[PDB]
Design an enzyme around this catalytic site. Structure first.
Site, PDB file in Angstrom:
ATOM      1  N   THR A 267       0.897  -1.245   0.071  1.00  0.00           N
ATOM      2  CA  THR A 267      -0.095  -0.092  -0.028  1.00  0.00           C
ATOM      3  C   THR A 267       0.751   1.356  -0.085  1.00  0.00           C
ATOM      4  O   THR A 267       0.561   2.210  -0.871  1.00  0.00           O
ATOM      5  CB  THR A 267      -0.892  -0.102   1.165  1.00  0.00           C
ATOM      6  N   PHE A 392      -7.889   4.557   4.864  1.00  0.00           N
ATOM      7  CA  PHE A 392      -7.342   3.706   6.069  1.00  0.00           C
ATOM      8  C   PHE A 392      -8.642   2.692   6.752  1.00  0.00           C
ATOM      9  O   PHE A 392      -8.244   2.042   7.584  1.00  0.00           O
ATOM     10  CB  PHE A 392      -6.767   4.355   7.113  1.00  0.00           C
ATOM     11  N   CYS A 399      -6.956   0.724   9.651  1.00  0.00           N
ATOM     12  CA  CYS A 399      -5.408   0.581   9.490  1.00  0.00           C
ATOM     13  C   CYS A 399      -4.634   0.823  10.673  1.00  0.00           C
ATOM     14  O   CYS A 399      -4.431   1.854  11.155  1.00  0.00           O
ATOM     15  CB  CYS A 399      -4.877   1.124   8.235  1.00  0.00           C
TER      16      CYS A 399
END
Ligand SMILES: CCCCCCCCCCCCCCCC(=O)N[C@@H](CCO)C(=O)O
Ligand SMILES: CCCCCCCCCCCCCCCC(=O)N[C@@H](CCO)C(=O)O
Lengths: 454, 454
Positions: A267, A392, A399
């Site tokens: 990512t 996120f 995240c």
């Protein structure tokens, strides 16, 4: 109570053949453009609903009503990531246990502790680019993958992938990309147990074996070591959950190492690649970011506090995550029967997909200029409505690496902007490669050194 | 007047099939062991005489009686090295012209000027080894080739091969090794125009094309930059021969660049590899060399004066050149009818081969212990008899790079011994690969960092 739009069907295959593409997220974005904030997606034996508006996504992000689901993609990734944090259900004991044990590894104190190791890898990137000969170019996503994998390896596990010593991909990366590509390619298969896919299954098992060989080495290297690290692996091996009082078991630790190596670099490499793409395509933005880097980064290498002071570089990174969030969807299930948006009745267990790039193009939130790269949208992040900017994910399943990734990306982009001028010498046409995650492919630039020593 | 011994023959092919081996120098050394100080070697259409004793080689080294010959090996290398310094006849105008223009590039003032760039590459080698994980090994000849090619590229041409950024060989190195291997393999061919060798010819021409593409880039990069540098390429492009008053022509400059890139790294990589081999096989010698490195190299990077102070490291390198001189033979022709050693009549034009590893094992010079690795043989240099030690060839055709190579190798071995302990973890069995030049193959060690910062 409304009927939901649905994209074109293929008889008994329903919508499944719409996934017969190497760019399924981009295909679903175009369907969202045509059908609007919600559409039904049917495959043999299942249904999900793709959401694209902040109006509906703000309800989906209500943790009293919806919990994280494993998408088909994450059920396939779970074949190698197990009940690690990314592919565990919220109700599995090992999700909350690992969440409690590992969150301290992302505290402000932990982040200050990772800074020196992030600088170690960032300096390797700058030295590589300083050492290029006249008119040599940079392979951007390739070098960003070198940096991000080395950073999570060193900071997380005190393990050196030494990616800058290789012109070929690390065996781990070849196997990881092929495993993610297989998970993506499996999405379109009506009959995944067709013997036509036997070679795919063999290659997938071999790639899982390569990833587990690397995990064996990281663990052996640590249990052997006479150093005293206090990093992510120290917390995995020693940390106790305050709730249960239990540490992680060996099987779960192996799944967490695989999870953090993959999630912790794929990512972030995408983000840095997209950020550099947008900067070379928006020279006034590049100039503003370069002026900030020159004004703030007054020492041979950046301090922790100097990286926190790169406000405009942070805004550039948030604006890149707005347009191309590199983990571009997340899945939810209804905890109980409920009505979405006063219009769409759902039953307990019904699945939703949040299409993040489309959420991030909601003109009712961002205005009519949603395709423009304008970091100034993030001058005051508090101005963004709830659940409008979700690169996120959401809530307790958001995240864990958000601050780690943004610190790494801000440090590296800051150093890149301090040390070099950039040229889009090929007038690169954006080509977004999908492996569940998103990244530019074939993106090259030239860097001219400003000849500022380290 | 004596009759010369001759090794076993193969009918009409005479001695030619003795070269049908990937280790021809080692085969000729074993023949010298069997036949003694001189033997005749016949092939269809030619004869040479292999010399192994100081008694005969001291006469061969008389420049009034004998001049440098191009061996068959050098005639094949001349296909790509042309009338560069290594493959030119002494009587060709371009030999003395290039010799006069380039000799000042190897002055003490020039060497002090190259030092910082040698340290640049040496630091890259030390950083590579510092960054290895627990129980990872070093591929010694591979890393020594990375260092020596990068050093001649940067010092000589301000060109970065960036060999430490590659796990695969640089295209130049693949093509160079294959061109030298082809020159060596061509030695045994009775019928080189057999269509069986058409693929060999095509590959050889392609490898010459790859080498000439690199030369194009080095020259273009310089003419573009302007000057700013005062290096070997500056002298090649600007220098005038004081004798003729002429500069080098474009064709000869291209041949000199190819010559210095090949000669300037292949031989030095072999020396460093053999030196590390002998040190791990002779731990008392390793300890003496490591103690000197620790005592002398007191600063984070070595100075020019500190490298001149590493006397014992220099003795180690000379003792490695005694046992395995990495350009292991040179050829001479008789300028006039003459008698060699009062016993062997030669006619004008008759050829000799000096087998340097055998000269260096002459027990009448060195004593009975010639196979032992004893750097102390070089503690009182004037005690070495005239023409007993010839790793750099002879007279006006001796190696122009001798001081460059020994400075590089002393700096690098000094830093290696300062920063690491070495383990021969496989009990490596010496395997010497031949490509005209000599180098260990498959030599691996483990380095344990002494944790001394740069
Ligand atoms: C081990 C940790 C790293 C995991 C990799 C991160 C993956 C992040 C993105 C995952 C979602 C990608 C969306 C794929 C497109 C899509 O919409 N898929 C649906 C298709 C409908 O079934 C699904 O998977 O049902
Ligand atoms: C362009 C600069 C690099 C040049 C390459 C360096 C070459 C160093 C030569 C080392 C000696 C080669 C000995 C090969 C074995 C041999 O003895 N050959 C004879 C065979 C008899 O004809 C010959 O070549 O006649």
């Amino acid at each position: 109570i409304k009927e939901m739009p649905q994209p074109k069907t293929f008889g008994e295959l329903k919508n499944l053949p719409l996934l017969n593409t190497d760019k399924p997220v981009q295909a679903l974005m175009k369907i969202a453009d045509e059908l609007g904030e919600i559409f039904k997606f049917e495959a043999p034996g299942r249904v999900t609903r793709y959401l694209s508006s902040q109006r509906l996504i703000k309800e989906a992000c209500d943790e009293s009503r919806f919990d994280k689901n494993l998408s088909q993609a994450l059920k396939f990734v779970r074949d190698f990531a197990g009940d690690g944090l990314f592919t565990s259900w919220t109700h599995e004991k090992n999700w909350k246990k690992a969440h409690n044990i590992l969150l301290p590894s992302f505290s402000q104190q932990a982040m200050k502790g990772y800074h020196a190791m992030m600088v170690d890898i960032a300096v390797q990137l700058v030295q590589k680019w300083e050492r290029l000969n006249a008119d040599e170019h940079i392979e951007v996503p390739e070098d960003m993958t070198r940096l991000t994998l080395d950073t999570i390896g060193l900071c997380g596990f005190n393990y050196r992938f030494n990616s800058f010593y290789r012109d070929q991909p690390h065996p781990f990366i070849t196997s990881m990309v092929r495993a993610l590509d297989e998970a993506m390619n499996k999405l379109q298969r009506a009959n995944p147990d067709d013997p036509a896919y036997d070679e795919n299954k063999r290659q997938f098992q071999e790639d899982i074996k390569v990833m587990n060989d690397l995990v064996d080495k990281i663990i052996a290297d640590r249990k052997a070591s006479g150093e005293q690290s206090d990093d992510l692996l120290t917390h995995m091996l020693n940390g106790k959950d305050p709730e249960t009082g239990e540490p992680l078991d060996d099987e779960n630790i192996r799944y967490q190492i695989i999870t953090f190596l993959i999630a912790g670099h794929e990512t972030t490499s995408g983000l840095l690649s997209f950020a550099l793409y947008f900067l070379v395509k928006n020279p006034h933005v590049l100039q503003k970011a370069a002026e900030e880097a020159a004004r703030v980064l007054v020492d041979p290498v950046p301090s922790y506090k100097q990286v926190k002071q790169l406000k405009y570089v942070g805004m550039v990174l948030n604006e890149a995550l707005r347009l191309w969030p590199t983990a571009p969807a997340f899945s939810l299930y209804a905890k109980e029967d409920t009505v979405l948006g006063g219009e769409y009745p759902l039953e307990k267990g019904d699945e939703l997909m949040v299409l993040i790039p489309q959420l991030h193009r909601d003109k009712t939130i961002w205005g009519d200029d949603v395709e423009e790269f304008r970091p100034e949208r993030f001058e005051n992040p508090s101005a963004i409505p709830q659940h409008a900017f979700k690169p996120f994910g959401n809530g307790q399943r958001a995240c864990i690496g958000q601050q780690f990734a943004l610190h790494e990306a801000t440090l590296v982009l800051g150093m890149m902007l301090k040390h070099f001028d950039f040229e889009d010498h090929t007038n690169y046409e954006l080509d977004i490669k999908e492996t569940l995650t998103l990244k530019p492919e074939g993106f090259v630039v030239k860097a001219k050194s400003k000849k500022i020593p380290l």
